[PDB]
Design a protein around this ligand. Structure first.
Ligand SMILES: C[C@H](CCC(=O)NCCC[N+](C)(C)CCCS(=O)(=O)[O-])[C@H]1CC[C@H]2[C@@H]3[C@H](O)C[C@@H]4C[C@H](O)CC[C@]4(C)[C@H]3C[C@H](O)[C@]12C
Ligand SMILES: C[C@H](CCC(=O)NCCC[N+](C)(C)CCCS(=O)(=O)[O-])[C@H]1CC[C@H]2[C@@H]3[C@H](O)C[C@@H]4C[C@H](O)CC[C@]4(C)[C@H]3C[C@H](O)[C@]12C
Ligand SMILES: C[C@H](CCC(=O)NCCC[N+](C)(C)CCCS(=O)(=O)[O-])[C@H]1CC[C@H]2[C@@H]3[C@H](O)C[C@@H]4C[C@H](O)CC[C@]4(C)[C@H]3C[C@H](O)[C@]12C
Ligand SMILES: C[C@H](CCC(=O)NCCC[N+](C)(C)CCCS(=O)(=O)[O-])[C@H]1CC[C@H]2[C@@H]3[C@H](O)C[C@@H]4C[C@H](O)CC[C@]4(C)[C@H]3C[C@H](O)[C@]12C
Ligand SMILES: C[C@H](CCC(=O)NCCC[N+](C)(C)CCCS(=O)(=O)[O-])[C@H]1CC[C@H]2[C@@H]3[C@H](O)C[C@@H]4C[C@H](O)CC[C@]4(C)[C@H]3C[C@H](O)[C@]12C
Ligand SMILES: Nc1ncnc2c1ncn2[C@@H]1O[C@H](CSCC[C@H](N)C(=O)O)[C@@H](O)[C@H]1O
Ligand code: SF4
Ligand SMILES: [Cl-]
Ligand SMILES: [Cl-]
Ligand SMILES: [Cl-]
Length: 347
């Protein structure tokens, strides 16, 4: 079909595999710009002009897993490992709340040391501050997720990475797509607001794989969807592979908004790493969330999932003010509340 025809089907919500494949395969500038406009408009209509700020503290770069794409993979000996103390994490969260953060995201490698009880203790202390707590700690037993929910955690981010089970197992040799999905289903069952999402441009990933990622997200109706380009890391087996394409990744974000109009969708730091101003573009093509880095020195520079991260040389407290300026210059507003999902039930 022509681009005009694909757009019309998207506007009528005929979200067929064929329509999604064609949307991702067409490279016409006019088509792409119309797609981005559509996603921007849907975002405005369903989630408004508030951009929700989630302050992220990357509190440990220790990891037991060996994901082929990730700089924190256990086989990477060329990385100084660190662990923030629970007191450091709590006080760093407190500083973020003092700076106006209404959600605190705790992210780490899969570091056994903290699991589950130290995390629970930290979550309890941060919840006293009257903010939302989101965890992004990887794959753990149901019992750990249960304990963290009881401790007061609100949300959990666990990107599905790739919905192709063969590619998933190759890239993540400690685990499987089946495991990843089971974690996500468990998190939802436990009452977390649950985030999934994927990387774009992984080695061996196809356009049909991207369509499958979109259909998977639509199937499970996730509260949050985190999408970024694959960025090769020099100290990993994928060092010499091609980076994901910014425009294709942007189309995935746009299509995600169109498919899941009331979801929360970040403009990820990976988008701003591969293209200067990439986050700002992404906030205008369907995204409505930003995650300023709140990891303190000297640890921020050591949390290297991928290289070149833009947040690294800035002062400890720079990123919250930075994103507030960003939000204003985009003609948007900061979030007024915790920015939980506001479901619009439809047909
Ligand atoms: C209208 C004025 C003159 C020219 C000068 C530089 C041009 C931009 C840049 O070329 C970068 C980019 C290339 C894409 O292709 C299309 C979009 C974009 C943003 C261009 C838009 C427009 O064309 C600009 C602002
Ligand atoms: C500012 C420049 C140059 C305008 C000019 O100088 N001529 C114009 C030219 C094409 C415009 C983009 C496209 O529309 C696609 C997309 C639609 C969303 O809705 C808002 C985001 C985005 C990326 C737009 C932003 C901006 O508006 C652009 C870059
Ligand atoms: C942390 C310190 C010391 C005082 C303190 O510990 N303050 C706790 C405030 C707690 N809250 C954020 C919940 C207040 C919300 C009030 S509000 O009226 O916005 O609803 C205070 C003193 C001045 C404050 C900055 C300025 O103001 C400018 C700017 C306003 C934005 O907006 C948020 C960002 C920013 C950079 C502010 C951050 C922070 O806050 C500062 C550094
Ligand atoms: C100027 C840089 C390249 C910088 C560099 O690295 N040199 C390139 C890389 C990705 C490009 C954007 C995307 O294509 C999406 C979108 C398509 C619209 O059509 C026009 C607007 C927009 C925002 C594009 C503008 C511009 O063209 C970008 C920022
Ligand atoms: C303190 C730094 C410099 C400046 C740069 C942009 C400013 C914000 C924006 O103006 C939007 C809004 C008004 C209020 C809020 C969030 C402002 C707070 C503060 O004034 C900021 C963060
Ligand atoms: N090289 C790379 N390029 C782009 N994104 C990457 C990347 N390496 C890792 N990521 C992304 O960073 C996200 C957080 S990894 C940290 C949280 C947890 N260990 C977990 O695995 O879920 C991953 O879900 C992945 O999508
Ligand atoms: S993606 Fe998460 S689990 Fe995999 S190596 Fe990186 S930090 Fe560890
Ligand atoms: Cl969140
Ligand atoms: Cl994310
Ligand atoms: Cl990212």
């Amino acid at each position: 079909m022509t681009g005009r025809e694909i757009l019309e089907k998207l506007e009528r919500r005929e979200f067929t595999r064929e329509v999604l494949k064609e949307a991702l395969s067409i490279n016409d500038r006019g088509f792409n710009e119309a797609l981005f406009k559509l996603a921007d408009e849907i975002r405005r209509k369903y989630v408004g002009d508030e951009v929700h700020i989630r302050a992220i503290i990357e509190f440990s770069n220790v990891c037991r897993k060996n994901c082929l794409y990730c700089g924190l993979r256990r086989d990477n000996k060329n990385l100084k490992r660190y662990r923030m103390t629970p007191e450091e994490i709590v006080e760093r969260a407190r500083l973020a709340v003092q700076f106006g953060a209404k959600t605190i995201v705790l992210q780490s490698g899969e570091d056994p040391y903290x699991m589950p009880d130290v995390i629970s203790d930290i979550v309890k202390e941060i919840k006293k501050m009257g903010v939302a707590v989101t965890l992004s700690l990887g794959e753990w037993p149901r019992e750990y997720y249960e304990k963290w929910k009881e401790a007061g955690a609100d949300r959990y981010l666990l990107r599905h990475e790739t919905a192709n089970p063969v590619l998933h197992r190759k890239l993540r040799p400690d685990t499987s797509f089946e495991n990843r999905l089971n974690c996500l289903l468990t998190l939802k069952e436990l009452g977390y607001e649950t985030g999934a999402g994927s990387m774009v441009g992984l080695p061996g990933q196809t356009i049909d794989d991207l369509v499958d990622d979109l259909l998977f997200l639509k199937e499970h109706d996730f509260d949050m969807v985190g999408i970024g380009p694959f960025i090769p890391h020099p100290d990993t087996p994928l060092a010499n592979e091609k980076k994901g394409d910014f425009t294709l990744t942007l189309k995935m974000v746009a299509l995600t908004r169109i498919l899941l109009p009331d979801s929360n969708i970040p403009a990820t730091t990976a988008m701003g790493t591969i293209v200067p101003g990439g986050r700002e573009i992404t906030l205008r093509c369907g995204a409505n969330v930003i995650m300023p880095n709140w990891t303190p020195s000297p640890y921020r520079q050591l949390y290297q999932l991928y290289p070149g991260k833009i947040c690294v040389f800035e002062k400890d407290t720079a990123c919250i003010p930075c994103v507030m300026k960003m939000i204003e210059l985009l003609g948007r507003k900061p979030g007024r509340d915790w920015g939980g999902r506001k479901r619009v039930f439809e047909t």
